Amino acid sequence: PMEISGTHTEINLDNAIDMIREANSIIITPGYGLCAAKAQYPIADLVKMLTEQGKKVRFGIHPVAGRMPGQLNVLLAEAGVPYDIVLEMDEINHDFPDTDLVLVIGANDTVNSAAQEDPNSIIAGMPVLEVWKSKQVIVMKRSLGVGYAAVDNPIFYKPNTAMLLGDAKKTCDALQAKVRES
Numbered sequence: 001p002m003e004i005s006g007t008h009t010e011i012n013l014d015n016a017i018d019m020i021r022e023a024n025s026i027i028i029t030p031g032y033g034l035c036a037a038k039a040q041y042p043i044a045d046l047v048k049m050l051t052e053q054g055k056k057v058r059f060g061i062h063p064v065a066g067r068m069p070g071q072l073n074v075l076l077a078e079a080g081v082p083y084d085i086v087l088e089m090d091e092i093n094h095d096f097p098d099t100d101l102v103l104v105i106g107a108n109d110t111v112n113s114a115a116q117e118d119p120n121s122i123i124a125g126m127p128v129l130e131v132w133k134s135k136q137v138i139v140m141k142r143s144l145g146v147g148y149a150a151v152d153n154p155i156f157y158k159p160n161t162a163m164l165l166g167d168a169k170k171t172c173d174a175l176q177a178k179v180r181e182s
């Protein structure tokens, strides 16, 4: 007769645009989900607009993000993202504590804090993008489902994390549009 629960929060599109329009420095960490949804394009358009608004928007790529080495880099470059704003984990990781908003798009295992928080975890020690250290984190995936490593991710139930559920492309097409309506 045992039980444990977890509480996560979900925000809506409009609320999302606020955090985005309010943040000065943003870091986007894409993963397998962004690929499966083919959301390189909408998120690239969005990043373009936000950058023309004086906002500092950059991507943080995990070495083993997606399903092939440097796969996210290729997809972003195909969408037009400036190679200069696409940084690797080791180069941008120390900037999470100084970031206003981290948009986690279709990523999970690569931003799993259990790597550092749970000693009995199968990914214990594995380097991860420390997104939970920034001010506000918005996780964009279809649910609180697991990733490749089939392991629960603690950042879902963290105070500074908000879940914006839905296909990575539908969501990104929406934010892209609503940010244009600004």
Ligand SMILES: NC(=S)c1ccc[n+]([C@@H]2O[C@H](COP(=O)([O-])OP(=O)(O)OC[C@H]3O[C@@H](n4cnc5c(N)ncnc54)[C@H](OP(=O)(O)O)[C@@H]3O)[C@@H](O)[C@H]2O)c1
Pocket (backbone or CB within 6 Å): 030, 031, 032, 033, 034, 036, 037, 063, 064, 065, 066, 067, 068, 069, 070, 071, 105, 106, 107, 108, 109, 110, 111, 140, 141, 142, 143, 144, 145, 146, 147, 148, 149, 166, 167, 168, 169
């Ligand atoms: N890159 C290489 S070389 C490679 C090779 C083999 C294995 N791996 C492993 O694969 C993992 C990759 O890390 P990651 O962060 O990219 O991966 P996962 O942790 O694989 O992330 C996939 C996440 O995206 C979501 N997703 C899937 N389709 C989506 C969609 N259409 N729209 C929005 N979200 C969607 C999933 O959640 P929902 O189901 O809730 O949407 C899922 O939890 C690592 O564990 C790595 O070790 C990498």
